[PDB]
Amino acid sequence: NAMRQSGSWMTIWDDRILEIIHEEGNGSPKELEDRDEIRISKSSVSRRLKKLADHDLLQPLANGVYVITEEGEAYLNGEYDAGKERYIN
Amino acid sequence: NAMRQSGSWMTIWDDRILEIIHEEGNGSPKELEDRDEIRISKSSVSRRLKKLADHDLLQPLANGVYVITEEGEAYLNGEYDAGKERYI
Known part of the structure; x- marks a missing residue:
């Protein structure tokens, strides 16, 4: 419900x-x-996926599958500051 | 309610x-x-504002002030394609 607290390392395709x-x-x-809704290349997507996982907004599973984390979810809901990398309360 | 359809020229700060x-x-x-919520500088914000207005997502008023347009609203609601620049 609150506004997303994005990090300075993010691109718009990250939110997408x-x-x-x-x-x-x-x-x-x-x-x-x-x-x-994705207007970047397959390799760029891979790059963003790797980045989101580094920031624990996603996690890599077997066979190149990525899945969202609690932090990723909280971030979409304005509850996790993806710049400072802490929950917000 | 549908997902935003962003343009290749946009940054995350544009949505914010x-x-x-x-x-x-x-x-x-x-x-x-x-x-x-805004982690870019004033000068940087100033440029994003100009670009959003260029693309009709904001209306610029006098004195460097902006308000959102119908197309900007539609964009946030997933009803406007900010890349091809057309309603959906």
Whole structure:
């Protein structure tokens, strides 16, 4: 409900990727690439996925599948500051 | 309610900026840069504002102040394609 607290390292496609994985459950480069809402390349998506995972907004599972974390969820809901990297209360 | 359809030229701060202006009803570099949600500089905010207005997502008023447009609202609601620049 509160506004997202984004980090200075984020791009707009980060929010899109997080939103898509939140709704679909999991994501992978090829299938994210094919979304209308994603206007970056499959390799860029891979780069953003790796980045989101480094920041613990996503986590990598077997076979190049990525899935959202609690922090990723809290972030979408304005409850996690992705810049300072702490929950907000 | 549908997902936002962003353009290749946008940054994350554009959404944050549009969202804030949507809530408060206006925006200027100074007041925006003071929001905690905004992690870019005043000069940087000033440029994002100009670009959002260039793309008709904000209307610029005198004295460096901006308000959101219908197209800006539609964009936030997932009804406007900010890349091809057309309603959906």
